[PDB]
Every structure is written in C-alpha cells, then in structure tokens.
Paper text:
Human (h) Carbonic Anhydrases (CA) are zinc metalloenzymes that reversibly catalyse the hydration of CO2 to bicarbonate and protons. Among all CAs, the IX has emerged as a tumor-associated cell-surface CA isoform mainly induced by hypoxia and involved in the adaptation of tumor cells to acidosis. In tumor cells, its enzymatic activity contributes to the balancing of the cellular pH gradient allowing the generation of an acidic extracellular pH (pHe) and a slightly more alkaline intracellular/cytosolic pH (pHi), and this has been associated to increased cancer cells invasion and metastasis as well as to induction of stem-like features, drug resistance and recurrence. Among the ureido-substituted benzenesulfonamides class that included SLC-0111, a structurally related compound, here named FC-531 (4-CF3C6H4) was originally synthesized and displayed high activity for inhibiting CA IX.
Author numbering: 1 to 125, 127 to 261
Amino acid sequence: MSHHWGYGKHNGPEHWHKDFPIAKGERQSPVDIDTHTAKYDPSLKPLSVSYDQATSLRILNNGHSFQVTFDDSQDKAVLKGGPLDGTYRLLQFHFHWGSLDGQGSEHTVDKKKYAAELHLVHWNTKYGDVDKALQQPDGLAVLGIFLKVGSAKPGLQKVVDVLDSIKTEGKSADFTNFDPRGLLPESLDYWTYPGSLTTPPLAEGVTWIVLKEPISVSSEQVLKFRKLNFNGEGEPEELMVDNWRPAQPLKNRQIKASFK
Ligand SMILES: NS(=O)(=O)c1ccc(NC(=O)Nc2ccc(C(F)(F)F)cc2)cc1
Ligand SMILES: [Cl-]
Ligand SMILES: [Zn+2]
C-alpha cells in the first residue's frame, strides 16, 4: 500500500513519477484514442500474428496482475507487419481490469472504458533479449485487446480455470500448451501510436497496436479475475481489482488507424 508501487491511494499512478520520473514524459501510455482525430494510414500493412508454434511456460501472480510467460529463445510466436519493422517475439501476456464492468481498461476509445484490457507483449529480435529491448525506443510492441462482458471466450477459459491456484502474490503454476490464438477477436483492424510501458519502469519503448474489436468474456470469467489478491499469503486481503493506469497526455503524438 506504500511499501512498493501499486494501484492504491498511497502507491498508485499519481506517485509513480517519484521513482520513475519518465512517468511525466513525452510518450507515456495509455492514452485516449479519439477515433475522429486518428488518421487512416493506407500505407500501414496488415498485422501478421503468427502464434501457431507458441510455447507457453508458466502463469504467475506478480502482485499487480497475472501473467503467462512464453519461451522467447527462438521465433515461435511472433508479431510482424503493421507499423513494425522486423520481427517481435511474444514474451508474455497479462490483463488489467476493474472492480465494476465500466472500468478496467487502460486505453480508452472516445473516453469509453472497457471492463478489461489484454496486453500481449513482444520484443524486437534485433536487440537479442528483452532486457536490451527495454532500453530502446522501438524495443517492444504490445498488442492491446479490449474485453467487454458478453458470452464466454472459450480460449480464455483455461486461464480462468487456473486462477484459484495463484491467488496471492508470488504464486506460480505450470501453464504449458496454451494457445494464445484463442484470445484474439475476428478482426485485426487497429490503431497504433508510440508509447510506453503502463507499469514501472514506464519505459518509452513501445509501439502500441490496439485492436478496434473487443473480445467478449462472460460475467463468470471476469468475476474470477476479481478474486485474485494483490497481497502475498498471510497479509491482509486486498482484492486485485482496478490495476489500470489512466490515460496520459498525448503530447506530440499522432494515432494512426489501419482502417477507414
Ligand atoms: N502493461 S504493459 O503491457 O505496458 C507492460 C508493462 C511492463 C512490461 N515489462 C516486462 O515485460 N518486463 C520484463 C518481462 C520479462 C523479463 C525477463 F524475465 F524475461 F527477462 C524482463 C522484463 C511489459 C509490458
Ligand atoms: Cl505498500
Ligand atoms: Zn499491461
């Protein structure tokens, strides 16, 4: 609540700049996507999402989200095309969500907040490892996908099923043989802009690719997210909800759209 960065009144996003002054930088994320200002760019290529050989490893409650990690030693699950130059390897995905269904997303669309947001995090292979990539202005690409409540997303259910085994900070479980293709919406139409990580260290090295089409997840799926805990085992129970950073100033940036 004050012993480490987080999302509460005493350690949340308004405090982060003290340890990470780039929090007040020129290319911070998330942002509000004003759909009427975004520019259709007919020269953007279709996004290429190649996840058929993805090799998942573990699922972890890291005290700020839950995250599924992948083997990124080789080009297995990669993102290419769109605004990207070269090849970006999938490292991990995680979510941000709310306490109620009208908040939880980091990006907004014409100020609209979604119930949650999925981030599929990739790094640029030209830098050899993620640690080096994190120091570059084009080191990372994050594919952001909004979640709204509707019918269940079948490809999310194996994630939901394991959450009770990682309730508290520091717990992990085996999470091999998970196929992230099951998390995507039908359309790959997107907005893109240059930004940052949305958690410390807030590094300004991300090409954001935010899909226009949300996925629908069921009420029961989101309720299971909201049973996770921020705290470690034995500490006062603080439900892991509202683990989202609000929109940051756009400053000197243009958001581009892949679609008219
Ligand atoms: N919310 S967001 O999508 O903007 C976002 C925020 C923070 C990160 N940070 C990392 O993935 N860091 C990282 C992972 C993994 C490793 C490894 F263990 F592999 F070296 C070393 C660093 C990514 C994305
Ligand atoms: Cl604390
Ligand atoms: Zn994220």
